[PDB]
């Protein structure tokens, strides 16, 4: 399928009109990954940093584009996003505990189309840890506590495996395009991984996607693949015929994955087990804005209140946004009787926080 990008422009830390902060352009939920994001100053183009291409569980992509510094001394900052699902470039102005382990794979049908044909990134608790592409075929760390606790023989061993998996992904892609009787620009995605619940429960998953839509889903309990297609059903019969491979996948997800997860958790016990509380700010521009800055972990709940019940009508959700420090921020708005009290409710460590915003 094809999905339009969702865009939000915000600052890392609350602006001070003198304190140089970081401008952020979060572009997420899009597919295909063909995109270019530009930060703007009164229309002019600014040199900005762009993060690695990252993947969500729903097969969509997301990028964090940020400028080195913005003091915000009486100017107009915006963002330019051009995508295949857009006719004209969209403009957005700036105005002011269960642990998991995931491994993704992104394959692009030949030729390059500008993008690396194969990309593999690993995540623990949505922290990037590993990276690999078909351009520079190298096992690379994306966390400090990853490289420091893994000897160079580990990355050399997996850089070889990845080269094998890269080639295998390329063949599977051609095999799919032939089955679907079409050629050209097509994408292929894989996501494997497990998660450790707070109580001790564990779960695991293996999924495949073609062109951003669900293709094959594996069930480790009944040792079977699920297909939602007449084409994906073909591969299902091939894969299910190999009972030993199905068994091997169950073992990896249940035993081997969990083992790796706990191993990496001990490595990053400092960053992954921490809790930083949110700083709540309230503003008005009618419309009342409630912000929450620099919290961790991402799990959070915010809602506006009226005397003092939750407001469902005329509200905006915002969603969980990356801050850039390794922390996160969100926001909730409400459009506006007599003598009514409007206050923002936030729960993190829970720990219920309330900030009184407005009254008559």
């Amino acid at each position: 399928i094809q999905r339009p990008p969702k865009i939000q422009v915000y600052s890392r830390h609350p602006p001070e009109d003198g304190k140089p902060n970081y401008l952020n352009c979060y572009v997420y939920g899009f597919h295909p990954p063909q995109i270019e994001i530009d930060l703007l100053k009164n229309g002019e183009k600014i040199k900005s940093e762009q993060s690695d291409l990252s993947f969500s569980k729903d097969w969509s992509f997301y990028l964090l584009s940020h400028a080195e510094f913005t003091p915000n001394s009486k100017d107009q900052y915006s963002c330019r996003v051009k995508h295949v699902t857009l006719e004209q470039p969209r403009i957005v102005k700036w105005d002011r505990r269960t642990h998991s382990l995931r491994y993704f794979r992104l394959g692009i049908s030949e030729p390059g189309y500008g993008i690396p044909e194969f990309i593999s990134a690993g995540y623990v608790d949505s922290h990037p840890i590993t990276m690999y592409n078909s351009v520079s075929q190298l096992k690379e760390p994306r966390a400090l506590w990853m490289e420091e606790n893994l000897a160079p023989d580990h990355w050399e061993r997996y850089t070889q495996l990845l080269r094998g998996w890269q080639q295998a992904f390329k063949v599977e892609l051609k095999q799919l395009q032939h089955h679907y009787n079409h050629s050209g620009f097509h994408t292929y995605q894989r996501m494997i991984g497990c998660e450790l619940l707070e109580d001790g429960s564990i779960t695991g998953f293996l999924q495949y996607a073609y062109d951003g839509q669900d293709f094959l889903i594996f069930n480790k309990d009944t040792l079977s693949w699920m297909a939602m297609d007449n084409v994906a059903d073909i591969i299902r019969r091939v894969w299910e015929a190999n009972r030993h491979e199905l068994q091997y996948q169950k073992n990896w997800l249940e035993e081997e994955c969990i083992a790796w997860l706990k191993r990496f958790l001990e490595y990053g016990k400092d960053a992954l087990q921490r809790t930083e509380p949110p700083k709540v700010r309230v503003n008005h521009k009618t419309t009342l804005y409630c912000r929450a800055y620099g919290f961790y972990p991402p799990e959070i709940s915010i809602n506006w209140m009226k005397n003092g019940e939750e407001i469902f009508q005329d509200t905006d959700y915002g969603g969980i946004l990356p801050s850039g420090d390794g922390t996160y921020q969100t926001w909730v708005s409400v459009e506006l009787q007599n003598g009514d009290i409007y206050s923002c409710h936030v729960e993190h460590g829970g720990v219920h926080m309330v900030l009184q915003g407005f009254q008559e």
Partner: antibody
Amino acid sequence: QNIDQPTEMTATEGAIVQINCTYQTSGFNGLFWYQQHAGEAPTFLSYNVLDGLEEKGRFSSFLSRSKGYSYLLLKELQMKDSASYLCAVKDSNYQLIWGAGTKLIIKP
Amino acid sequence: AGVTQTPKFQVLKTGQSMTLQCAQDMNHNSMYWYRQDPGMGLRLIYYSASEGTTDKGEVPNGYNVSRLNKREFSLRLESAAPSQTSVYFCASSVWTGEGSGELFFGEGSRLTVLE
């Protein structure tokens, strides 16, 4: 890191033999049994990942991930069964650790 | 089909160079070279996950390797040593990093190096 199995075993034709194999590795991604006739290529016999038994004809292989234990069970021994039996385990990284095989001598 | 390996027997004087040929007819991607010795399990000298890439194994000392095709994988030893007396096996599998994927061996190559 380590994998052990008997050096030699001797059994009569028509009988039943059991070759044990014990391993202690970093991780576990499967256990293979290979048959190798003297002066010839080793060939794949059986494979185990999950706990339990795997039966293919007269040959059956058992695995216990907790114990790190596996046995190859040969029933109704024929003369052609006389060979070396190689036990092998996939490491946490997908490398393959080979134990020095068990030579089986079949008496008519 | 099968995994073809040449030669089966070779005698060498210490210091001689020699190369072993291995051809795989099964359209496989991973290829290996093993070294079988009495009292020891198979040891991997060099391997290749797919064409274009190769890497050292458990005992790479004194050996060289090259992947010509997707079909051919050659073992080269430029300066033969008496310690290199063994039975070399060329093996082939569909993929590396797979779990249940078995190995396909060649008939075997008997090597004895003498002073």
